Symmetry: T
Subunit: 145 residues, 12 copies
């Protein structure tokens, strides 16, 4: 794949609980939208989700060998805690865009800090699912303007 | 199960090393006591331990689909570091009680901070194995008239 | 007495205001429950409440001459401010368990700090009145195994 | 206008001479792109730039009386300093998205703090001029689903 | 003239617990020594101890009334907490020397801060009961050079 | 429609020392002015002063049972140190206005923090005795518009 | 003798938005009330409002040359940010009283800090429009005792 | 002009108030001295003062188009607050020297921090008017080989 | 005797990227050198690398059951984040030496803190692969003096 | 059993400047008084002053070889800065008393911190030259009870 | 001497390593330039450099006895660490100007703090050798206007 | 010499007191081993110890003139305090390795901070005398690969 989308812990829960909390949108719905958006541009896109830090790090290492050109990553809770993730990305030297569904700055103070943002190309937060689509549009443009 | 008891990393070591250090009580002994206490009240109780953050997060997710009503969790070292665990509990919206065998406030300053305590119903620390039993007693009363 | 239960400032207000707000449970109800629980184990139990730091200190000093074996203390607001109270407990060297009705970690940041917790056997918070009962159960087992 | 795009201090330097900017892009080029994007959705869009905090505040107040439904704001340096701006936006209660051309997290530590981000719908940084277009896309969908 | 010696909370315990721990010296022994030392210089000396902050404040107010020229105070735990005590001393404008039996700098970090030390003539700590005698020697010389 | 005015520690010293220092105005003068101002509006007003935290807490608890509608409080040194006071006011749920004679912000840094101000209707400081009159004027309007 | 009342940024919005949000009182209403209050005491009073820091600073400099004796200032958001404003007031050496409509201490932590309060005669916050009337009452008594 | 001298807010007050306070020297006297010093070296020098941040930012932008080679700036209070000013200077990439009349380190702690000093060639403070002459001397020497 | 060498997350990447960046030395090369050095002293050297925290915790627990005498550990990114690792080492009570290839003090501030260093026998950083050899030399001498 | 008195940097200046600023007492006067006090108790006492840290460290090392039993040290400015001094005292394991002429707590905040006080037997400050005499009186009692 | 120039540790290295690095200017050259400048004004000027803190302190003490009227000091690294130096300058009460060749604010955070700057007449940094000449100009004018 | 070994304050005390406390190893023993190790590799090695900061700085300057290629330095206490040392090493641009006998991370929190570690090639602590040998091994390989 040329673009890899990574989702961090707890994102698998999207749309599961009381679909009038945060409605009906699922992680799969998001993935399908992105895969279709990428197919439109003849770009190959892979997706990955895990609750396990190590599985995400392993997947990043694999991305390097597969010739992934850009990573779109929503590290979820791991953005505030995982230097291992930072060092995986940097160690494979694949540029990345950081995405969060919710506005990270509007929540508790510990969510204001990120071990990834300072090394990302850019960061999108608080725009829901469309944030991932925006990241993908940017990525496509960078590769095939 | 109605009640799920979760033990974090390193709690599998209980009673393994020099049973004159901290004596002979094992994690299994704790679990047996709790299972018997729950059986006495005709409540179904399950237990889980892991050294792997992701395994705990996955287990919490599964708790939601199983209809667990309350979680009793000793996150051990993960209390001070895991936002992923916080967000797992909050994401499934299962109420929980936090338990530690030892008095966390009597140890190093980094153990005074918890990513769970502020969202727990309550917190018990420093009362050894009985802490879990107390949490269970509370839980039983909350769930049953 | 063998066991002494101390309640700090403002706890006399329990159940007084709009008993629907936090319901109907009074300080006296709590004391009666504890006195009965103690009688059931043939342990003598005394109780004390004051809004005056000095009265609490004096009472602790008296506990020493009376041969009190363990103190269960809900210092309420004094937990965050009274080094005098810490030094009274340490000076008479009577082991103690700290109890709070409400979850101190779920409130303002200044409530996260305690001049007692680090010297307590353990701490219970957020489990309402049952917290004192749990502390008593522990205490009984410790004194008369 | 339905949508108002605000550019803060020093943004007038883009392209005219490039302060330290890269791409040869100018503020007028950005505006033309957004106006055309907005026309394409039959949404009316105005733009505004100033180096003067008071002018921006006045403009926000004027937005209220004009029935503006959403503000896309690149406050530039004022994001780190201007509580007056925060209070203008909150006082008129117009929702806003915050946009920065550059990655504000990749620079000095003082740029990590914002008096706006916590109250924004969301924040986009580091994606250049496309950041504004993404905001506008989000805004269009929100206003005209 | 008149010197007043004030002892804070818990100092009444001196020599009561296991005279092995820190031995046999009592608060009354200290007071006797000081009263004799003062009598030897034909200076009138009064003493006061309380566990109650308000009593100590009242006593300081009374001091002014009695024309006390200098206060020797061991505030004990109140040194780290009582602004009321600071303001009492300042409000009557009686100069004072602060004394502690134990070395306050050699204990927990919270004991390093004092609401009195910056307004004392001087501070003596860690020299046991002699600290009070030294303070009295100084005071005598200051009042009757 | 009773109003209660509470004065904290050390306020009894007003006008006692060197009536040139802070002038001749006494606490009793302030109380007389307030009682007369309240009588002019046919509002019943009581006053209370103590050096003792517990006396103040008790007096607040009594205010509830007496049907006091608003408290005007100058906690003096206790504003920076008493959570017990905060919790007494909040526990009786009587609205209050915080007053200080002097400008608390112009003094030492530790005086800049208050355990009351965030819960007060408002705060007045630095305007001398008039501050209490202003608080009373506001209170009267609020209770009997 | 001349009193100048200065209103800072965003205060022009008063009473504009949903008059049940914060009701119907306007900045003009406030000024009318203060002008009438001043006429009643035969004091000349001027008023000023701006969203522009430099306009306010200029106005302060003009106040010096006009012989203004006292300034009543509600700096609004500038209280937390503007050292320029501090230095303008200090540079002209006109005493001032700081007023806020809302209780600044009851909001975000950054609103607890002021570049003005420590140099003000006093401060009033959280008493709404009356706060300005109180400041004027004080000012009148100070200028014409 | 080859050199531009910028004076920040409140510097227009120099020598206005009680000329035996901080003397008779005026902003004009400073400017006249600098213009004469520059004329003596056949260097063209312009000067600018404003109380309005945006005007200063605009003036810096204009300096770029006028071919200014070096800026001598006394940002006065804006040194501690204005990131806009920092980003103007950096954006036009004109080197600058920072000057203050008074010793910024000898005052309040907040004046120890600057958004400019770290990017300045150098900083002169506390040497009165001669500071600007020294900055100009330096600048002349630099604008040569 | 067995010595166990643990390599943390991302160390599997050594000598993959740009072998002129940090050259050609691989994790396997390091291990082979260590194994040969251990064989020379008739000590068994076991090695382990993982990207997964839990795997490393499990491996430490396994070390205890197999009678490992000393651990040499490069936790890599987990140094700064993993209390679980600290508690694993301490729980098994195997002595350990901490090693880093790069100079952790020369990088970002968050790399300055270690959850292991305070409990390690010692620490080596910045000496590349030779660090591990040095740790092993020390370890051999400690096991076989 | 010798006592050694150590005076730090700048103490040689005592009584040199404007003998009315701090009067006439010189370092040599202090030393003569202490030497006489010691002779009176048949204790051998040596003294030492230097402006050079290393000289003081060397002198402490020499004290060990000379069999000194107790050090009375006024480190002056070195109390706040010199870990080398701390480590010299600890390394030779000679107990010490810290003395300062002035009240170190009444000055700048940086003077509140000491690298000695926590390891001293005790500390005396603010009692002038008598402080050294008091330390000597204590020392005599400790060595010859 | 009338004016004394003091150079701190490591300044002897100027011009001694890689003259195209920091070029060819030596500490001697700086001194020769100053001595000549002083001769032009018939002012007697002495200079001093040392790597040893004590030597500098001694030299400052000597300056007092010589009747030195002003000190120009570049403390180099000692500015951030030496309270001994601060106290020497203050103890002899000779006014001083602080000079640094390089811009101390543009370097590591620890270099932003000075134990001298707050007591200096003023401070010059970042203007190379000319800084000292400026300081000397100022000093000459102050001493012989 | 090609390599220079520097030992800081108090290291001369090694093996002097209670050779059971830390045994018998002396500084001279360490130097002899290093000299022998260096001779074995045909490298010239010099050593130096002092308790005086200035002596160490002077010695470092001298190392430059002697062509020293690498410094092995145990700064002991000066690591936490001496910017002068840092600047000496940087100013001569001789690479260096930092060594401590004891584990600096296992002691007080202030020992965690170093003014050298960040500019060292690497750091070794806690491995006793062997730490110096290791540094020498590394240095030999760097200089004569």
């Amino acid at each position: 794949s040329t673009i890899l989308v990574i989702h961090g812990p707890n994102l698998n829960l999207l749309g599961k609980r009381e679909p009038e909390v945060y409605g009906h949108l699922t992680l799969d719905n998001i993935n399908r939208q992105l895969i279709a958006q990428a197919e439109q541009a003849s770009i190959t896109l892979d997706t990955f989700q895990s609750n396990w830090e190590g599985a995400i790090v392993d997947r990043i290492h694999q991305a390097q060998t597969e010739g992934v050109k850009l990573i779109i990553i929503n590290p979820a809770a791991l953005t505030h805690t995982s230097v291992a993730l930072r060092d995986a990305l940097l160690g494979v030297a694949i540029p990345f865009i950081e995405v969060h569904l919710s506005n990270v700055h509007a929540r508790e103070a510990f969510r204001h800090h990120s071990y990834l943002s300072d090394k990302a190309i850019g960061v999108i937060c608080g725009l829901g699912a469309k944030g991932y689509s925006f990241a993908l549009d940017y990525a496509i443009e960078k590769i095939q303007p």
